[PDB]
Every structure is written in C-alpha cells, then in structure tokens.
Amino acid sequence: LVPRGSHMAIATINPTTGEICQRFKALTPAEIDAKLAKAQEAFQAYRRTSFSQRRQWLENAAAILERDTSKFAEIMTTEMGKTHQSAIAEAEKSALVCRYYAEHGEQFLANEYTETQATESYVCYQPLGILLAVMPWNFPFWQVFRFAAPALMAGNVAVLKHASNVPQCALAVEAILEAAGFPEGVFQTLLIGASQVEQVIKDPRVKAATLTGSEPAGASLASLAGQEIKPTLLELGGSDPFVVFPSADLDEAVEVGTVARTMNNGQSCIAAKRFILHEAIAAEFLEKLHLKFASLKIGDPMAPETDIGPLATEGILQDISRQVDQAVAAGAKILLGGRPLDRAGYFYPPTILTEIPPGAKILQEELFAPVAMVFTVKDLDQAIALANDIPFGLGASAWTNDPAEQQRFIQELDAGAVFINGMVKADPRLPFGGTKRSGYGRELGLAGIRTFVNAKTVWLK
Amino acid sequence: AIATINPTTGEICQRFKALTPAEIDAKLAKAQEAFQAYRRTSFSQRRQWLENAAAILERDTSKFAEIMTTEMGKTHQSAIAEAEKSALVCRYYAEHGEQFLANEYTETQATESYVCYQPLGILLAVMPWNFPFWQVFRFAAPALMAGNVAVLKHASNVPQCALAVEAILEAAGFPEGVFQTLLIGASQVEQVIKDPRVKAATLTGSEPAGASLASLAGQEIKPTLLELGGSDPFVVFPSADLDEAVEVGTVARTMNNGQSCIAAKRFILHEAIAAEFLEKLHLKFASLKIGDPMAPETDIGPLATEGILQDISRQVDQAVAAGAKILLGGRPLDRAGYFYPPTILTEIPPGAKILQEELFAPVAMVFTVKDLDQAIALANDIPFGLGASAWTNDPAEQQRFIQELDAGAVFINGMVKADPRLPFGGTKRSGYGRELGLAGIRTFVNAKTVWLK
Questions:
Q1: Could you say which architecture CATH assigns to the domain B1-229+420-453?
Q2: Do B175 and B30 form a contact (C-beta atoms < 8 A)?
Q3: Which residues of B touch A435 (CB under 8 A)?
Q4: Could you tell me the end-to-end alpha-carbon distance of chain B, in angstroms, rounded to an integer?
Q5: Which residues of A touch B117 (CB under 8 A)?
Q6: B305 phi/psi in degrees, rounded to 5
C-alpha cells in the first residue's frame, strides 16, 4: 500500500470522531473528458423532453427525498457534522424546491411576446447545454437541489463538483436523480479536486458555471470562466448584521438571533454574525444572549437534544481559532467561549466577542462558526454605517416596529436581502443572492430558472 | 494611442493626452460622490433629463453624424440614423424605466414580501468604435434611469464621439459626475475595474478585450455583460422571396462598411436556389458606390483604421492561398484612405482558418447546402452566436430554424436588428447577458429580496 494524491484528496472524515470512514479516487483527465462526452450526448436528447416528463421526474425526486430523509440526513451528519434534526429539514427543503420548479417552471419559461411591426416577435427561453456546479459542504443537499431542480426543468444537463469532504452526499444526489428517472448523463457527479475544476470550465462543451462557497474558489472560477466568455453565478460568504433597535420585541430578537448565529453550527453564509445593538436596548440584549448561548447543548449531532455539533473539518476549526485568538490579542473581550473544547472531534463552543477595537482584522472577516461579534450604536446612521462597513453583502436583519426606521433599513442596508423582524431565510418562492463580495446573480423564484437559458429574441416578418 | 485619424484621408486630425492614474482616481472619487445624490433623484427628474438628451440628439443629428463619419468612416446617412436610434433608446427608458423597476410582490406568510430594484453604483462601460453613439446610449439610458453613475472607456480612435456623449448628458441636465468619459488606453481599464468603487462592468467589442475585462471582473467578484463579435449565418431556402433576400442580405453584409457584429457574414444557400441567388448577389455588390462617406451617394466608405484593413487583407490573402475563390474584390483599392471593396469568397476548403473568423469588412462567404440538417449544422459550426437570419415561407422550416439555430437572436425573412423594445445579446463566444427591453435596465441593479414580519 501506497498513499497517492489521487486517493487522498476526497474522503468521508467524521468530524464528531475525527475518524476517516471512507476514501475515494479522483477522476483522471481522460475520465473527466468522457463524463462530458456523455453529458453532451444526453443533452441532445434531454432538451427534447417535455415539461411533463421533467415535471414527472422532479416529482419523483421529491418523493425519494421525503421517503428516505433520515437516511440522507445521517449521511449529512456523518460527513459534515450538522445536527440530524436540521439535516432532516434540509432534505425536506430539497424536496420543496424540486416541487417548486415542477409546478412553476414551464410557466416561467413560456414565450413572452412584444408587439412590433413583426408578424411575430417574442423572447423564448432555451437551455444553454452543460452547466458546471461547484458546491459547498455546508448545505450539501439543499444547495445542490436548488441549483439542479431549475436547471433540469429548463432542459440543461449538469456536472457537479462537490466539496471534497461530502463525497457521499454528492453520490447520493446523482443516485437520487437517476432513481427518479432522469436519464443517465443528465446529472453527473465529478469526484474531483478543486485544481481539476480548471479542466471542466475550459472544456468547450461546458457553457456556464455556478459556485456557492468562498472568495478564493469563486474568484478562481469566475476569472477562468470570464477568460473563456462563459457566464457565472456566485453566492459567497456574508457578514450579515443583525441590528436591534428600541421598539423591537427583544425576547424574540434574542431567540431568533441565537438560532440565526448557531444553526448549522454557525456555518452559514446567512448567519447573524455581527449583532449591532442600539445603546438603550443593549445591556439587556447582550446579557439575554449570553444566557441563551450558554444554554446550548454541545455534543453528538446524532443526538436529538444536541444544539451544536462539531465544525465540519479541522481546517475550519483552526480558521476560527486563529481568527479569535488574533482578535483577543488585538484587545477584544471574550464574553463567553473563545477556545476549542478539550475533546474528540472538531468542537468549538458558542462564543461572544465584545468591545472589539477599531482596526481589528476580524471586523472584515467571515466567522464560519458559532461566534458572534457584538457592537453598540447611538443612532440609525451609525447602524447602517457599521452594517455596511464590510466587503460582503448577502443578508441583513433589523428589528424595529417603527415604520420609518423599517423603510430606512430596507433602503439603505447594502445587502441582497433584508428581513425586518425576522432572520434571513432562503425561500424558493423568492430570488436570493449577493451583492459586493458576496457575489452576483440570483437563484430561486423566477430568476433561478432564467439564469442559465438563452433568452433568444425572435422576429418573424 | 488616443487620436482622431480620418479614415478617408489617412491623416491625423487631433491628439489627446490619456489620464494619469491619479486623474482616474479623482474621477472615481467624483463619481462616488455624485452617486450618493444621483440615487436620490426621482424617476420624474431622470425622465426629464433623459428626454432632454433625446432632444439634443434629434436636434443636432447632422453635426454628431459628422463627428462619427470623420472619426470612423461610416456614411453620413447611417450616422444620422445612429444618432436617431440613440435618441429612441433614451425615450424608451424614459417611458418604461420606472415601471420596469417597480416592486414585484409575491404572497408569503410575510406581511410584505417583495423584490425591489436598487442601483449598484459606479459602472464601467467599455465601448467600441463601430457604433460609437448607439452603443453608449443603449447602455447609458437604462443605467442612468436605474440610478447608477457610469464611467466610459471608449475606443481610442473615437475620442471626439466619447467627449460629445459626456457633453450631451451634462447639457441635458444630468449632474456633473453622473456620466464621465475617460480618455484612457486599454491597459488602464484594469485600474478601473479593480477599484472597489466600481461595482460591475460592460463591454461591447472583441474577444481579446472582453476576455481580459471579464477575467479581471471575475477575480474581483464583479458581474459583467459582454457583447462580442459574430459570424451570423444568412440562410436562404427555396421558398424564399429571393429578390428581397438579395437586397436585404446586401444591406446586412454591407452596412457600416461591413463592420457590424450582426452583419450577415456567412450566406448559406440551398442548392436549388444557390446559382440564382449567388449571381444576383454578385451583381449587387459589383455596382455599390465606393467613396467619401460624407457624400450621400456613397454606399461604401472606408474601414475605420489601418489595422482593420490589414486584418481583412491578411485574412482574405490567407484564405485564397488555402484554395478559396474570389468571385469579386479581394484587394484593397489603390487610393487614399482605408478602402476595401465589397468582396465575395466561395469554395472555401474545409479546415481553413477563415471559416472560424469574424470578417469585419464587406466580405461575404457563400456556401451551398443540400438540406435543413446540413444548413443548421453549418450555421452553428462557429465559436460565435450573436444573430441568425433565415429566409423561408414554409412554417415548419421556420420553426426548425427558430428552434435549432444557436444564436441570441433569430430573424425569419428579415435581417437581424437590435430594437430597443426587445432584448439583445449573444451566446457562446459572442457573450452573455442582455441589453434593451426589460433586461437592459435590470442588468445593473441589486434585485433585493425584502421580507417583513
């Protein structure tokens, strides 16, 4: 036996126990070439299917997700550490988005007509061809279905590169779609490393790409896609603010803030990361939040009662460890947590940072872990100024029952989404995506299915 | 680098100093400041200022037309038409822009859930020389109606058009700094795209510039829109009104002296009409008037630069040495300016480079095909896909063409034109995204989801 780079890049490593459970071989270039030939060929046939066949197959996928939610949930929890209960919910949402596009997708892609001197003039909507989807470990089913439901309803085929630490999830999605009846080659999972994504985008059969994840990989992909004249959609990190003002129901703010910071063990792009508290309401909020964080159960994510599993990988653990030690050293005050736990697996406790000095690195950084930054402010202008004083701009949440402050937050928060008296969620009925360094384009709603079609203008004399 | 060189006489009519990196920066500083205020203006203010710009265009079409003709060589009549269209697109977004940006509500368990449309901020536009007014207003009208500010990097050979556009917009009443023109070289675009104040960019042009712009935009996590070249098929099948097809195909190959991204460049002829059509096409091209583009009788003026003439000379020399046949033209004329004649090439060998190239000159490639399958196969046998035109009165053939041609646009019994009322853009190596129609003004905005408990 000999460890080879090929066999060592992709694995299931259970973050609860640290143990390597199973390893996989990455595809060769040749093998990749052949998957793409296969996709190109399935595309010629798949684009001729009817919305009926596609709706039928998508419905079938939804039913398989619902039947086996616990099985799929366990795969998620085993590979990347989320609570089993939240992983069951992610399977149910994955089914939901499949149903959303089965129901709306034909109508979303109908001809739109415009009166001109032409006998007929309209835009119609046609599949691009092979699409590449580069997806993250943190919502390993949901992110894949919210991309794949609309892309397949539109008539495209797709090749998925998943995060190298959720290969079982990735294989599970390929298998789900095959079992639902989508023809072989329509959706294929590529067991490949991040360096191999270059070969896929530069392949002439690949028309467009989408990436959800972080800046390094997103910059890489969109750069290369650009150089090849291929369109991308990017959803990257956030540092969403969670802004609390005097007229807010603080108890509910506290409950929802805690959930929004800690769900998925803090590893969400739309987590409440930076709590921005009005000075009147602040003492009371900070303390109530401290106490809730302190009540969270940290433990085995397979256990129903667990609120906080381990972080997903070792790397992820060192990131947040360094980011935090660094801030403490620059003078930041730990109200709670702030140290990895003395135990098996990649555990990091719920943590709260206060009195962060101006100039600290961490003000501009994404904390992908259950670690809240807290700030006090005098007025609405300071709150906007601080909320927007980041490179990112995905989501934002503000708590107030003053209609004027509500419209101000709605207008002036530089984010792709703004929730008022609620935590930012993604809901298939509505578009969703970033601004600034959080990315561009929109998934879900109408936009989700228009994103990768040729909007072909037609003019018949 | 940055100069007016009249392509009719080959001579330098005036020079311009490019900005320094410090001068660029200060323009960006000033765009940011103007954005903070411009974004608070009402649609009614913007509609008035847009309407003023249309009136300034319609009023001086002639004068602006001369600047275009003098700088880049199109016929004065067609410059006049470009100025009128530039005005049209302005009135279009002034009429529809507010409604196009209205909140769209969607019922949920929110009290209020909806999407609104907010300006992104500073936009960089990188425009080409071949439609130097139209390509800028097409981009600017929607962008300004949405509340963005813009900086424009125009082509180095049309600096006067570039300054006139800026001046038109200040004269119409858009506040200083809402639209600024930047006299800068291609290598300086990087500075601009990399500046954190610049939010998104757009480029109409060629692939080398588009690839570079979109590559750097990607690295910076910034969206772009690209409209690049094409090698549009013009496909003629046996039920076509042949005479119309010839008159219109000639226009489509020949307008703007063949320097159009949506010119008909590859004529694809069914064998049952090939001979008739080809002879007629041959006769039409042979008698077009080549000349001073200021003179109204002129059909064909010169190409816009020495390089453009060299490129097409090279490309045709190269194809002829490979075995292609010249039915007509195929050499630069011997007279002052950058004149290349209406030219037709036939019997091009398989594997010849030119089959894959964009011919930015009035040079037609002609092909004979046996059937619909084969016509579509060739229509699409290129790296581009902007437009496609097909001529036929069998409604089944019409639908096959509409469905299977790989283009951003398909016209049946007509030439491809960009109409402000409908979207327009490319696929494949022609680009992505859409200008005009509703898409035009949605491209450079934050589609913000709003959720109220």
A1: 3-Layer(aba) Sandwich (3.40)
A2: no
A3: 120, 446
A4: 58
A5: none
A6: -150, 155
